[PDB]
């Protein structure tokens, strides 16, 4: 039941310092190394560095001049600071639980729990919340069109997370404006069209936009 949760801003400007935290729950950060990892869109995993609260910290030689990793025992948190960012630092950032060191000083190599990841975009463009439009309807499709937001991502649930079936949220398209759009769709029985209501819950964390939209006949 140990879980890891990354957090930080979704948007930073070039040359700024990216600051992320990794909050551990269900267990202590004591005794373990904790690693930071990142993944540019469509690319592989890159190890950034690691920290053990009472042993050492280190980082990838390509990033060491810009990487500072630390820990906070009271908050049961690890942190990553990456300075002088550029577009090359746009990536999803992860933490992971790494090798455990016993009091004897011996250890067992591990890399067994990942966080969910947090998406960071490095850009000078301003945040923009989406506009949400319903896609109105023995089976029928309905959806929501989530238009003109920045940066990624938006999440779409249906009926406050209580609808989990024919739901599909598509990859976003990057429009020439530099803004993203996506749609989320659900396939529902035609008989429940005059009966059940369908509301998409759209969240855009970088603008703290929250929108509920009913898709009705």
């Amino acid at each position: 039941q140990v879980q890891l949760q990354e957090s930080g801003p979704g948007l930073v400007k070039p040359s700024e310092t990216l600051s992320l935290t990794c909050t551990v729950s269900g267990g202590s950060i004591s005794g373990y190394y904790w690693s930071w990892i990142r993944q540019p869109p469509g690319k592989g995993l890159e190890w950034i560095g690691y920290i053990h609260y009472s042993r050492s910290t280190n980082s990838n030689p390509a990033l060491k001049s810009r990487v500072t990793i630390s820990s906070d025992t009271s908050k049961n948190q690890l942190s990553l600071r990456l300075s002088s960012v550029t577009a090359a630092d746009t990536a999803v950032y992860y933490c992971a639980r790494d090798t455990y060191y016993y009091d004897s000083g011996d250890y067992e190599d591990a890399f067994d729990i990942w966080g969910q990841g947090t998406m960071v975009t490095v850009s000078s463009a301003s945040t923009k919340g989406p506009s949400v439009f319903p896609l109105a309807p023995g089976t029928a499709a309905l959806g929501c069109l989530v238009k003109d937001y920045f940066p990624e991502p938006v999440t779409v649930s249906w009926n406050s997370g209580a609808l989990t079936s024919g739901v599909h949220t598509f990859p976003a398209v990057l429009q020439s404006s530099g803004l993203y759009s996506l749609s989320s769709v659900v396939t529902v029985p035609s008989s429940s069209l005059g009966t059940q209501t369908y509301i998409c819950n759209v969240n855009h964390k970088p603008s703290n936009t929250k929108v509920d939209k009913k898709a009705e006949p």
Binding site: L45, A110, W114, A136, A141, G143, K147, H168, Q175
Partner: protein, 213 residues
């Protein structure tokens, strides 16, 4: 220099086995590795550790269809009884002095899944969007396999090329593919035609849907 070499892709049929390979650089041929799986759209999860002596230790909850083995500098992940959900990127990873490194990842394709024709739904611009003085036609393409389609848009029956954005098909929760195509128009253009058409070609067959203002 510690390097883990993975070839970028592997392929095998539904129900078969596949053996993915991760090669350690020569100075590190006795290292243990970990295998990580990243299904499309989600974060990585740990699969197992593979030890120098050939033993392996699966993570909690990882199916026993996944096993690991060793031969010299080679580290293997064998997946038996391949299922659609095994299509994923597989990364090996190891531990060095003050360092961890990942292989480049191997994308596994599971071939021979059941064929499925797409279901197409074409949505006209919403009244809300038109009231905002914009217009998007949304062509939703669902539940098809294999995951490749082409989309053709028409106005009244004449091909429309400009303002089309189509996503790359991605896997749905039911392991069939979906895709979306958007045609951007002005409200006046939308209202000026008799109809617009979205035509989807899939394995040499076409499915077409029409909407009118």
């Amino acid at each position: 220099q510690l390097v883990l070499t993975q070839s970028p892709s592997a392929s095998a049929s539904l129900g078969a086995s596949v053996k993915l390979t991760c090669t350690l650089s020569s100075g590190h041929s006795n290292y243990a590795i970990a295998w990580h799986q990243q299904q499309p759209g989600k974060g990585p999860r740990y699969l197992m550790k593979v030890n120098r002596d050939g033993s392996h230790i699966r993570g909690d909850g990882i199916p026993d269809r996944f096993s690991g083995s060793t031969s010299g500098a080679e580290r293997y992940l064998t997946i038996s009884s391949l299922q659609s959900e095994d299509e994923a990127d597989y990364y090996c990873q190891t531990w060095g002095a003050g360092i961890r490194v990942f292989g480049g990842g191997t994308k596994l394709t599971v071939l021979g899944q059941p064929k499925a024709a797409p279901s197409v739904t074409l949505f006209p611009p919403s009244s809300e969007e038109l009231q905002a003085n914009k217009a998007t036609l949304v062509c939703l393409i669902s539940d098809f396999y294999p995951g490749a389609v082409t989309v053709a848009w028409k106005a009244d029956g004449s091909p429309v090329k400009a303002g089309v954005e189509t996503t790359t098909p991605s896997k749905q929760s039911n392991n069939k593919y979906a895709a979306s195509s958007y045609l951007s128009l002005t409200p006046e253009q939308w209202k000026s035609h008799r109809s617009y058409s979205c035509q989807v070609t899939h394995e040499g067959s076409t499915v077409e849907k029409t909407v009118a203002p």
